[PDB]
Amino acid sequence: FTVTVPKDLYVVEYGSNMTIECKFPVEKQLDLAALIVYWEMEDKNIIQFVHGEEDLKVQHSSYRQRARLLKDQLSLGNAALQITDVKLQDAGVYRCMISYGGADYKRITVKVNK
Amino acid sequence: GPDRERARELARILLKVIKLSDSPEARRQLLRNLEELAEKYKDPEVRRILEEAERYIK
Ligand SMILES: [Br-]
């Protein structure tokens, strides 16, 4: 079981939206009761998608109303994180962890320019 | 080296989700991932993370 990222280094502008792709193998129909998707940066919980459901109370405040998992993509094996209106505090190392018949994770480094 | 450091980092993530999860099934699934990591890397840091995680499998 391998998680792969097509782009592990982002250089984004202040005020941009950014989409970070995080891919995992799906050789069947997606079995939602076996899937966990987790996104963080530093120790900030961004996305915690557990077996088809999310807990809004777990998401860090600085990502409330600004970060979302593109759930349409999950059936294709892409657990893409979308972040709206990027600011300097969003620079850093993002981590995407997938557990789906095995576990893996990737790091994505995000520089914010302005 | 770096692969071991990645395994330790993944293990820490698995523990975090366990602590913040409601679902016994999710917790068991992540614990399985941890034992899979312990089985592969035979690492004392992964082991201690696994030991702490086992305390949350209620
Ligand atoms: Br990585």
Curated annotation (Swiss-Prot), chain A:
Post-translational changes noted in the entry: Ubiquitinated; STUB1 likely mediates polyubiquitination of PD-L1/CD274 triggering its degradation. Ubiquitinated by MARCHF8; leading to degradation. Deubiquitinated by USP22; leading to stabilization.
Induction section of the entry: Up-regulated on T- and B-cells, dendritic cells, keratinocytes and monocytes after LPS and IFNG activation. Up-regulated in B-cells activated by surface Ig cross-linking.
Glycosylation sites: N17
Functional note: Plays a critical role in induction and maintenance of immune tolerance to self. As a ligand for the inhibitory receptor PDCD1/PD-1, modulates the activation threshold of T-cells and limits T-cell effector response. Through a yet unknown activating receptor, may costimulate T-cell subsets that predominantly produce interleukin-10 (IL10). Can also act as a transcription coactivator: in response to hypoxia, translocates into the nucleus via its interaction with phosphorylated STAT3 and promotes transcription of GSDMC, leading to pyroptosis.
Subunit record text: Interacts with PDCD1. Interacts (via transmembrane domain) with CMTM4 and CMTM6. Interacts with (phosphorylated) STAT3; promoting nuclear translocation. Interacts with CD80.
Disease: Truncation of the 3'-untranslated (3'-UTR) region of CD274 transcripts leads to elevated expression of CD274 in multiple cancers including T-cell leukemia, diffuse large B-cell lymphoma and stomach adenocarcinoma. Disruption of 3'-UTR region is caused by structural variants that stabilize CD274 transcripts, leading to overexpression. Increased expression in tumors promotes immune evasion and tumor cell growth by allowing malignant cells to escape destruction by the immune system.
Similarity comment: Belongs to the immunoglobulin superfamily. BTN/MOG family.
The protein's name in its UniProt record: Programmed cell death 1 ligand 1
Species name: Homo sapiens
Lineage: Eukaryota, Metazoa, Chordata, Craniata, Vertebrata
Protein's gene: CD274
